[model samples]
Target chain A: EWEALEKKLAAXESKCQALEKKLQALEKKLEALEHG
Target chain B: EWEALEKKLAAXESKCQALEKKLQALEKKLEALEHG
Candidate 1:
Protein backbone atom coordinates (compact mmCIF):
# COMPACT_ATOMS: atom_id res chain seq x y z
CA GLU A 1 0.00 0.00 0.00
CA TRP A 2 3.00 2.26 0.30
CA GLU A 3 4.17 4.40 -2.60
CA ALA A 4 5.68 7.78 -3.24
CA LEU A 5 3.57 10.38 -1.35
CA GLU A 6 1.57 7.49 0.06
CA LYS A 7 3.03 7.90 3.52
CA LYS A 8 1.89 5.80 6.42
CA LEU A 9 1.07 7.30 9.80
CA ALA A 10 4.42 6.07 11.15
CA ALA A 11 6.12 8.25 8.57
CA UNK A 12 4.22 11.37 9.56
CA GLU A 13 6.70 12.44 12.25
CA SER A 14 9.61 11.63 9.98
CA LYS A 15 8.00 13.68 7.25
CA CYS A 16 7.68 16.56 9.68
CA GLN A 17 11.37 16.16 10.54
CA ALA A 18 12.32 16.05 6.89
CA LEU A 19 10.38 19.25 6.30
CA GLU A 20 12.03 20.92 9.30
CA LYS A 21 15.48 19.85 8.08
CA LYS A 22 14.83 21.29 4.67
CA LEU A 23 13.41 24.47 6.15
CA GLN A 24 16.40 24.94 8.48
CA ALA A 25 18.86 24.35 5.66
CA LEU A 26 17.13 26.90 3.51
CA GLU A 27 16.86 29.36 6.37
CA LYS A 28 20.59 29.07 7.06
CA LYS A 29 21.32 29.83 3.44
CA LEU A 30 18.97 32.79 3.57
CA GLU A 31 20.52 34.07 6.81
CA ALA A 32 23.91 34.08 5.12
CA LEU A 33 22.53 36.05 2.21
CA GLU A 34 20.67 38.43 4.47
CA HIS A 35 23.28 39.03 7.22
CA GLY A 36 26.48 37.22 6.37
CA GLU B 1 -9.14 14.09 3.56
CA TRP B 2 -7.79 17.59 3.14
CA GLU B 3 -8.76 20.60 5.22
CA ALA B 4 -8.75 24.13 4.00
CA LEU B 5 -5.82 26.28 5.11
CA GLU B 6 -7.70 29.13 6.70
CA LYS B 7 -5.73 30.13 9.75
CA LYS B 8 -2.30 31.67 10.09
CA LEU B 9 -0.63 29.61 12.78
CA ALA B 10 2.69 31.45 12.86
CA ALA B 11 1.07 34.82 13.21
CA UNK B 12 -0.60 33.68 16.39
CA GLU B 13 2.53 31.98 17.62
CA SER B 14 4.41 35.23 17.11
CA LYS B 15 2.40 36.75 19.96
CA CYS B 16 3.73 34.04 22.24
CA GLN B 17 5.91 35.52 24.98
CA ALA B 18 8.09 32.42 25.10
CA LEU B 19 9.53 33.14 21.68
CA GLU B 20 11.56 36.02 23.10
CA LYS B 21 13.47 33.63 25.30
CA LYS B 22 13.85 31.18 22.45
CA LEU B 23 15.18 33.88 20.16
CA GLN B 24 17.53 35.23 22.79
CA ALA B 25 18.99 31.82 23.49
CA LEU B 26 19.81 31.38 19.82
CA GLU B 27 21.45 34.79 19.74
CA LYS B 28 23.82 34.16 22.63
CA LYS B 29 26.67 33.47 20.19
CA LEU B 30 25.91 36.66 18.30
CA GLU B 31 25.88 38.54 21.57
CA ALA B 32 29.33 37.11 22.29
CA LEU B 33 30.50 38.51 19.00
CA GLU B 34 29.34 42.02 19.93
CA HIS B 35 30.66 42.10 23.50
CA GLY B 36 32.37 39.10 25.01
Candidate 2:
Protein backbone atom coordinates (compact mmCIF):
# COMPACT_ATOMS: atom_id res chain seq x y z
CA GLU A 1 0.00 0.00 0.00
CA TRP A 2 2.74 2.40 0.97
CA GLU A 3 4.63 1.56 -2.20
CA ALA A 4 1.65 2.43 -4.34
CA LEU A 5 1.20 5.71 -2.54
CA GLU A 6 4.83 6.59 -3.02
CA LYS A 7 4.59 5.90 -6.73
CA LYS A 8 1.52 8.09 -7.12
CA LEU A 9 3.13 10.83 -5.05
CA ALA A 10 6.21 10.85 -7.24
CA ALA A 11 4.12 11.00 -10.40
CA UNK A 12 2.04 13.90 -9.13
CA GLU A 13 5.17 15.72 -8.01
CA SER A 14 6.62 15.41 -11.48
CA LYS A 15 3.43 16.73 -13.01
CA CYS A 16 3.37 19.68 -10.63
CA GLN A 17 6.93 20.48 -11.56
CA ALA A 18 5.94 20.61 -15.20
CA LEU A 19 3.06 22.92 -14.37
CA GLU A 20 5.45 25.16 -12.49
CA LYS A 21 7.80 25.33 -15.47
CA LYS A 22 4.94 26.28 -17.75
CA LEU A 23 3.80 28.96 -15.35
CA GLN A 24 7.31 30.34 -15.23
CA ALA A 25 7.52 30.45 -18.99
CA LEU A 26 4.22 32.31 -19.22
CA GLU A 27 5.39 34.80 -16.62
CA LYS A 28 8.53 35.42 -18.65
CA LYS A 29 6.50 36.13 -21.76
CA LEU A 30 4.20 38.45 -19.86
CA GLU A 31 7.20 40.31 -18.47
CA ALA A 32 8.71 40.74 -21.92
CA LEU A 33 5.47 42.28 -23.11
CA GLU A 34 5.50 44.71 -20.21
CA HIS A 35 8.89 46.05 -21.22
CA GLY A 36 8.66 45.78 -25.00
CA GLU B 1 -3.06 4.77 3.47
CA TRP B 2 -5.45 5.06 0.57
CA GLU B 3 -7.22 7.95 2.25
CA ALA B 4 -4.01 9.88 2.61
CA LEU B 5 -3.18 9.41 -1.03
CA GLU B 6 -6.64 10.53 -2.04
CA LYS B 7 -6.29 13.71 -0.04
CA LYS B 8 -2.96 14.53 -1.58
CA LEU B 9 -4.32 13.77 -5.01
CA ALA B 10 -7.19 16.15 -4.52
CA ALA B 11 -4.84 18.92 -3.41
CA UNK B 12 -2.59 18.43 -6.39
CA GLU B 13 -5.56 18.41 -8.74
CA SER B 14 -6.77 21.70 -7.34
CA LYS B 15 -3.32 23.19 -7.72
CA CYS B 16 -3.07 22.03 -11.32
CA GLN B 17 -6.46 23.51 -12.10
CA ALA B 18 -5.35 26.83 -10.68
CA LEU B 19 -2.17 26.73 -12.72
CA GLU B 20 -4.20 26.00 -15.85
CA LYS B 21 -6.46 28.94 -15.17
CA LYS B 22 -3.45 31.21 -14.70
CA LEU B 23 -1.92 30.00 -17.95
CA GLN B 24 -5.18 30.65 -19.77
CA ALA B 25 -5.34 34.16 -18.35
CA LEU B 26 -1.80 34.89 -19.43
CA GLU B 27 -2.42 33.53 -22.89
CA LYS B 28 -5.45 35.79 -23.24
CA LYS B 29 -3.38 38.76 -22.19
CA LEU B 30 -0.60 37.86 -24.60
CA GLU B 31 -3.10 37.54 -27.43
CA ALA B 32 -4.46 40.96 -26.66
CA LEU B 33 -0.99 42.45 -26.72
CA GLU B 34 -0.21 40.76 -30.02
CA HIS B 35 -3.36 42.21 -31.55
CA GLY B 36 -3.14 45.61 -29.89
- Residue A13 miss distance in model 1 (angstroms): 1.1
Give candidate 1's total backbone clashes. 0
- Superposed Cα deviation of residue A1, candidate 1 (Å): 11
Chain A TM-score values for every predicted structure, listed in order: 0.68, 0.78
Q: DockQ, in order, for the candidates?
A: 0.05, 0.54
List of clashing residue pairs for candidate 1 = none
- State how far residue B14 of model 1 sits from its true place (Å): 15
Candidates in order: C-alpha RMSD to true structure: 10.6, 2.2
lDDT of 1 at A22: 60
The candidate scoring highest on DockQ is 2
For model 2, the docking class works out as medium
Which candidate leads the pack in TM-score? 2
Those runs of model 1 whose alpha carbons end farther than 4 Å from true positions after fitting are A1-7, B1-36
- Candidate 1 lDDT over residue span B1-36, tens digit each: 222121222333443334455445546645654574
Best by lDDT: 2
